[PDB]
Amino acid sequence: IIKDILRENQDFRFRDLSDLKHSPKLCIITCMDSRLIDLLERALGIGRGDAKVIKNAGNIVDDGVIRSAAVAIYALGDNEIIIVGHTDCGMARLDEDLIVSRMRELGVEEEVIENFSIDVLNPVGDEEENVIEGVKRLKSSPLIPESIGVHGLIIDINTGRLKPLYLDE
């Protein structure tokens, strides 16, 4: 039997926690904000190999996020997702006009500018509501099994203190 154990082991790979049976299989969804680098990891007690991480502007759950989370679930065994918003994000406070002025400045086609406006501007609530909304989207998605735990938290961008908004399980 040792020969069969060795042959199978030559293909075994311990890449991260997903390759173990008793560790957390975590996926974190958060913002691209530079103040979250390092701080978020320490604040969550996370290190290398501890979680799959998705990041975009404002940690808004769109189709791309859902698809990446689904990859994490079906290919990497993730069974817990945590959206982490943060204070002083501002995606809930953009300067539409100033932004439009700059694009129009570099000659960006009006058609393009208009699309951008409807797609990224107008659509978005404030920090805590954006997180709750993201939780609802993930839980409502036919790509996300209900056996997956989905939590929503908001972190103080200066102190790292976490405030829970929604706790699943």
One-letter amino acid of 138: L
Nearer to Ca ion, 19 or 168 (CB): 168
46-69: buried (b, 16+ CB within 10 Å) or exposed (e) per residue?
eeeebbbbbbbebbbbeeebbebb
Question: In angstroms, what is the minimal distance from the CB of 43 to its own copies?
Answer: 11
Q: Please tell me the total number of residues recorded for the chain in this structure.
A: 169
161 token code pair: 């203190």
Interacting residues with Zn ion between 76 and 105 (CB under 5 A): 89
| Partner from its own copies, Zn ion, Ca ion, none binding residue 131, C-beta < 5-8 Å depending on class | none
Query: Which residues contact its own copies by CB under 8 A?
Result: 15-18, 23-24, 27, 32-39, 41, 46-57, 62-65, 67-68, 70-77, 88, 90-91, 94-95, 98-99, 102-103, 106-109, 112, 116, 119-120, 142-143, 145, 147
Is 33 among the residues that bind Zn ion (CB under 5 A)? yes
Nearer to its own copies, 52 or 151 (CB): 52
Contact 119, 140 (CB under 8 A): no
Nearer to Ca ion, 105 or 146 (CB): 146
Task: Give the count of residues interacting with Ca ion (CB under 5 A).
Answer: 1
Burial class (CB in 10 A: 0-12, 13-18, 19+), 136: middle
Is 111 among the residues that bind Ca ion (CB under 5 A)? no
CA 67/CA 157 separation, integer angstroms: 27
Binding residues (CB under 5 A) for Ca ion: these are 146
